[PDB]
Structures are given as C-alpha cells and as structure tokens.
Design a protein around this ligand. Structure first.
Ligand SMILES: NC(=O)C1=CN([C@@H]2O[C@H](COP(=O)(O)OP(=O)(O)OC[C@H]3O[C@@H](n4cnc5c(N)ncnc54)[C@H](OP(=O)(O)O)[C@@H]3O)[C@@H](O)[C@H]2O)C=CC1
Ligand SMILES: NC(=O)C1=CN([C@@H]2O[C@H](COP(=O)(O)OP(=O)(O)OC[C@H]3O[C@@H](n4cnc5c(N)ncnc54)[C@H](OP(=O)(O)O)[C@@H]3O)[C@@H](O)[C@H]2O)C=CC1
Ligand SMILES: NC(=O)C1=CN([C@@H]2O[C@H](COP(=O)(O)OP(=O)(O)OC[C@H]3O[C@@H](n4cnc5c(N)ncnc54)[C@H](OP(=O)(O)O)[C@@H]3O)[C@@H](O)[C@H]2O)C=CC1
Ligand SMILES: [Mg+2]
Ligand SMILES: [Mg+2]
Lengths: 370, 373
C-alpha cells in the first residue's frame, strides 16, 4: 500500500478524499492535519485509525495513543517524521504555501488542491520541484482536465467557468447583492469562500495563474470561457485543428481519485455519452471586474500576493455584512494600487511580508467602504 | 533531419491530399510514388514534385527514361527495398493494401496506414510483422487518429462516431429501394464513391471497429459506435473514473494525414475555435444498418472478415452500376458470409488471398441472383 497524509482533512476536499479511500483500495492513510474543527477531526481519527495528527490552529487535542504535533511547524515536523508516499495538500488560504513546500520536501507525490501556493509563491514551488523532483499532480477539476490532455505545442488552453451564482442577474443589480444571493452556487459543492470567488471570478483568476505555473504557459495562450452546463472542464486547442476536451460529472472525487491513483484509473462510475448542450461565452468585463485584473498582476508575485490577500479580507467582510457584493472588487482594486512599484519578492519571507501588509491595507480599505 | 517519404497510391484521394500537405509544410522530401493506372496524374506528380522513382502496379506503359520505373506484381516491394524511405504512406485501395503494408513494414521506419483491408483481412499478419521489425505504424483514418491521440491502457469504452450516411434520416421502408443518386450526396465528409456507399450502410464503421481492435488491442466489447450527426467529435475514450476524453476537429483529412506524417510534431494549419453546440450521440438502428450488425458474427474469424470485405467490394460496385438497389448490398454480404460458415482460420498471406478470391467469385454469383430476382 502507498501511505497518505491529508493536510486539511476536515475541509471539503479533505473529506471527499476520505470518501475516495472508502471506494478504492491500495492507499493507507497514516496522518492528517486540521486547524480548529476538533469534533470532525475526532470522527476521522476514530473512523480511519489515524495515529498521527498535526494541529495547526489554537485547539487542544489530547491524546494519548496518537502522536500529536502542534504549532507553526507541525505539518513540517509530522511530514519529516512520516515521510509519506503521497500528501494531499487541501489546506485553505495562504498557509498552503508553506504546507506545499514542506510536502514537496518529504513526500514522493504531492496532490495539490491549495491555490494560494502557486498564485503567491509559484516561483518558490517551481524551484523546490526542480530541486527535489517530487511528483506534483493538481486536484482542481480544470487543471486535472488539462493535465490529462496537455502537450508541448498548443495553440490555446481553455478553462471553463460556471459564471457563479449571479451569472444571470443584470449588471446594475449585482453591486447590491447580499450573501443570501451568492450562496449558491450553482454548479459545485464547495466552501463559502470559493462560492463567493466563483461569483466574482476571482477563483478563475487564480486558476489562470495556476495553469501558467503548472504548465509553463504564457498568459497569452490561456483563455477562459463561461460554460453554463459545467460538463467540459478543460480543452486544449492544437495548431492543426484538433481540440482535445475533457468531460466529466462535476464531482471533485473524480480529480481527487486521479491524483491519488495516477497512473491507474480508478473504477467509479463511467460517464455515458448522450446528446448534450455545450455553450461557451466570453466573460463580460462589466460583470467580472476583479477577473480582468489578471493582465495588471500576472507578472508580479507582489501584486498576485496582494490580490489574494485583499480578496481574503473582502470576502470575509462581505460574509460578515460589512460590505455588499460590489465592494469586493473595489477593495481588491484599491489595495492593488498601494502595491504598485513593489519589487519582485525573492524569498518566502518576502512573500509572507507582502501578504500581511496587504491584509492590513485591505482592512483599511474595507473600513472606508463599510 | 529531413525525412524521405514514399506515397503508395499517390494518385488517389488520400495520396493527393498528402501531396497538398507536403506543399504547405517543410521537413519531408517525397522520393517515390506508386500508382495503378492514372498515367496523366502520375506524370504531373512526377513533374511537379521532381520524383525520380515510380512503381506501377497496373498494366500500363510508363516510358522512360530519366526516372526509375518498377513494373509488374513485385514493383512496390522492389522499389521500397531500393529506396528505404523514412516514411511510407500506404494509401492504395482494396485488397492489394495487405501486400503493400507488409512490404512497407519491411523497409520503412514509419508506416502511415490509410488502407483498411490490410487490418480487416490480415490484421494478424500485420501485427506479427510489426513485432519482428519494431516499426512505427500510425493510422491515418480520422477516427483512429483521434483515438490514437487519447488512448490509454485502462479505457472503459472506446467510442467511434459515425455520420450515419446519406440515408440517416430516411424511413426504413424507403432505404431498401434507394439508388446511387440518393446516396452519392454528402452529409459530412468529402470522399470517393466507395466510401460514400460504405458510410450509408455503415460497413465503413464495421471496418473501423475491426481496425480499432487491431490497432489498439481492444476486445470487441470495449468498442462503441454512436451516430453523431454534427461530425465534430471524431473519437472519444470513456474512462472508468467518470472522465471522458474527446477529440474535436473539422472534417478535413489533411489533419490526420499531417499528424501521422509529422508525429510527434503538430503542424500549424487552421486552429478550431470553440463555440456553442449541441452534440448528438445515438445508437445505430439495427433495422437501418443490418450489415454493420454482422460484426459480432465475423469479428473472431479472418476468413469471415476477408469474405465480408470481398462481398462488400462486389456489392458496392453492383449498386453503383445499377444492378441492385441499395437494400441488395447487405443481402449480398449476408448470403456470401453464409457460404463461409465454418471456414478455418487462415494462417498465412496465401490463405487470406485464397479466401478473398473465392468470396469475390461467390459474391458475384449472389449478386447475379439478386439482380435477376
Ligand atoms: N472545495 C472545492 O471544491 C475546491 C477547493 N480547491 C482548493 O482547495 C483548498 C481547500 O479547499 P476547501 O477544502 O473547500 O477549504 P475548506 O475551508 O472546506 O477546508 C480547508 C481545510 O484547511 C484547514 N485550515 C484552515 N485554515 C488553516 C490554516 N490557517 N492552516 C492550516 N490549515 C487550515 C481547515 O481546518 P478546519 O476545518 O479545522 O478549520 C480545513 O481542514 C483551497 O485552496 C481551495 O481553493 C480547489 C478546487 C476545488
Ligand atoms: O466502514 P467499513 O466497514 O465499510 O470500512 C471503511 C473503509 O474505509 C477504509 N479505511 C479505513 N481506514 C483507512 C485508512 N487509514 N486508510 C485507508 N483506508 C481506510 C477501510 O479499508 P480497510 O478495512 O482496508 O482499512 C474500508 O475500505
Ligand atoms: N478517402 C478517405 O477519405 C479515406 C480513405 N481511407 C482508405 O484509404 C484507402 C485508399 O483511399 P482513397 O485514397 O480514398 O482511394 P482511391 O480510390 O481515391 O485511390 C486508391 C489509390 O490506389 C491505387 N490503386 C487502385 N487499385 C490498386 C491496386 N489494385 N493495386 C495497387 N494500387 C491500386 C489507385 O491508383 P490509380 O488512381 O492509378 O488507379 C490510387 O492511387 C482505402 O482503404 C480507403 O478506405 C481511410 C480513411 C479515410
Ligand atoms: Mg476549479
Ligand atoms: Mg474514418
């Protein structure tokens, strides 16, 4: 059996990974990390007989027949001790950057669900990947699809987007939208943040930057289309007229299983061909202004990190009632203005300093907009 | 760096589309051609491509003089032995493609296979020669090219798509009485009279299923055919996890030709741009395409597959000549196959060629019966 560690086991991706382990044999889960959801963590440790846990938040796990690592280097120290064959990196937020770097150091394969790691610190991940040679497979549905059809000479890589919860609403009504209108979603079963991110298309902006890092694509070779039905997860347009497309049901257990079991294909449920509707349209810049900030930020890890930080602050603020929907892209825009002229970060510490300064600035902007 | 090419059957549809590709991308030098009887087109290919080597497979005069000319029944094998091309495009029509593919596998580094008969009738022979030589074989057919591009060992289903042919929207009662003028109109693809009729009966698709089993080493049970009226999807693989990989492209044979010739490089032609579509996939009606549903009966026997091919060749020509109506085609095939029930599995090229010859003779007798009746 191949040994597995799931970082962020208590989250959406984490628990879907557990579901997959019940459905397919050949991997043994030997450790998990979680942040603060102790009740769920307890269920997992009992159900899966997990003897190694890294606590990442300010919570009390005790104990006493299981090894419990706690604090800021818990993930790193657990991974060094366990040296798993496979690590699923399903932590949310900016913590994903250090989690991925530690996973690359101590695992033979890293299954990457966390987006922030490549958005903010892709240059660090790429350096570590080259040095260590660790296998890295994306878990995101769109990058899993691309991974399956990618080749060296492409004309265009097409990512598809649902258009989010407000895809149908007209422009003037979107500014005023409340949380009770953004949840949800209406295509994927995901955490509260990702749902807001799909509605602003910030999620898709992250995926473009992730695709550039993962597949060494220039910005100009990527295109994003709104695709209502959510069947096509990615397509590659080749120079000869051929297009390779990947279709599947919208269930994250599919790309999870692929990343865990590659090069084997897991037996889940085959998707049988039938008459089908495939629509592809350009995102309207007036409906998705934060998405169109990509051109402005793509070349700078300082601006990419600030983009992510401001989005984290604005979504939280939106979820807590301080701003309305139209305030999200404004917080991001106004925060980015304050980082123009920043030098390109060179180290993990540089990236971390930008992130915390940007959180600080975005909070000030949010206060103004509240 | 430059690769040399021989095109067997250079004067045909595939051959001239290959020439069209060679005019608009560099890296391949045409050094030899074969043709059967189209002297006028062969000389013009020779002049315009500066070809110095020609194999004539038919009984025609091609004299002389500044070029090397091979003639008679061994002309392809002899020219290939002399030329040793890097690539041979095998685009001869009909049963002689089996001999041509085997000859090509002897003397090329890569064989681009357009000819269907070679695998339908003699797949076991081709596979044996492939193993001994270790030469590359890339299919040129657009469905096989599509599958080649997405194939992997653990597929659940390989899906070939079919236009359904000229009579796809017709009532079953009208089909039996159809004439060549009904069939020889063009729903999705631009090709010869033979391929157009085979598309209407879906015998073309029966050939492609058998070729797919040979090319990709798939059991018959893992192949699915769907009628796909848009003709945009040329093939798909269904994986056991829920993923489906599909290949979409314009219905232009220059695409898979360029892919086979230049693999692993992709030639810059005209990129296809994604847009809103419905995509239809329906099962073929057994009552509409009876000759297609003879697959399950013939699939394990090279004797039956060779007879199926021969009977088809006879029946299609008789149809085009006005001797039988469209419904007569599947009847010629069925009745000819009934005469070969129990024939032993051929073991050599010579066994295959004997079955071919007798099935042609048997199918002609059947055709006369149906014509006079
Ligand atoms: N959900 C989806 O469908 C998809 C998600 N992704 C990406 O995967 C990542 C995780 O997504 P999702 O599972 O939905 O997120 P969730 O919020 O549902 O769960 C995230 C996990 O990370 C833990 N966590 C939270 N904060 C920290 C922290 N500061 N340090 C370490 N661990 C922490 C949580 O612990 P606890 O519960 O105890 O607080 C939980 O275990 C994200 O980057 C997301 O963009 C990508 C594609 C699709
Ligand atoms: O309720 P059940 O009795 O149906 O079993 C639960 C499933 O989860 C699997 N499972 C439990 N713990 C682990 C683990 N640590 N790693 C991988 N799979 C696990 C079990 O496999 P198993 O019985 O092989 O541990 C079993 O397939
Ligand atoms: N056409 C298409 O779109 C596709 C075709 N194919 C397959 O490719 C093969 C050829 O296709 P296509 O180019 O359309 O056929 P054509 O009838 O257009 O031409 C066949 C070629 O074979 C030569 N030829 C004819 N008879 C003989 C013979 N007895 N011995 C040696 N050579 C002969 C012809 O010479 P000449 O002109 O001098 O008589 C010509 O060069 C067939 O198996 C067909 O099914 C597969 C996929 C797509
Ligand atoms: Mg995604
Ligand atoms: Mg074909």
């Amino acid at each position: 059996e191949r040994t597995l560690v799931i970082l962020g086991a208590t989250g959406s991706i984490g628990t879907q990974t557990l579901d997959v382990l019940k459905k397919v044999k050949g991997i043994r889960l030997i450790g998990i990390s979680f942040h603060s959801n102790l009740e769920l963590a307890f269920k997992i440790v009992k159900e899966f007989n997990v003897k190694n846990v890294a606590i990442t938040g300010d919570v009390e796990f005790e104990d006493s027949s299981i090894n419990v690592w706690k604090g800021s280097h818990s993930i790193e120290e657990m991974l060094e001790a366990l040296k798993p064959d496979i690590t699923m990196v399903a932590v949310s937020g900016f913590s994903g950057l250090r989690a991925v770097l530690a996973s690359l150091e101590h695992s033979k394969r890293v299954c990457l669900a966390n987006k922030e790691s490549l958005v903010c610190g892709g240059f660090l991940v790429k350096k570590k990947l080259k040095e260590k040679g660790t296998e890295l497979i994306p878990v995101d549905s769109e990058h899993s699809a691309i991974f399956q059809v990618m080749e060296p000479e492409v004309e265009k890589v097409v990512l598809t987007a649902s258009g989010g919860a407000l895809r149908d609403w007209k422009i003037s009504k979107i500014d005023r939208a409340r949380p009770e209108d953004v949840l949800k979603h209406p295509v994927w079963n995901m955490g509260a943040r990702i749902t807001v991110d799909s509605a602003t298309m910030v999620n898709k902006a992250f995926e473009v930057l992730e695709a550039m890092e993962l597949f060494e694509l220039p910005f100009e070779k990527i295109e994003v289309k709104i695709h209502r039905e959510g069947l096509v997860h990615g397509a590659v347009v080749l120079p000869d007229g051929n297009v390779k497309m990947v279709v599947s049901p919208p269930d994250m257990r599919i790309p999870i299983s692929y990343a865990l079991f590659y090069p084997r294909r897991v037996a889940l449920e085959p998707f049988f061909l039938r008459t089908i509707s495939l629509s592809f349209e350009d995102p309207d810049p007036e409906k998705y202004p934060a998405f169109f900030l990509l051109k402005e930020i793509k070349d700078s890890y300082a601006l990419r990190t600030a983009f992510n930080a401001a989005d984290e602050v604005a979504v939280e603020a939106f979820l807590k009632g301080r701003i309305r929907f139209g305030g999200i892209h404004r917080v991001i825009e106004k925060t980015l203005e304050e980082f123009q002229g920043y030098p390109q970060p060179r180290t993990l510490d540089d990236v971390e300093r930008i992130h915390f300064e940007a959180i600080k600035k975005a909070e000030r902007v949010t206060e103004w907009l509240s």
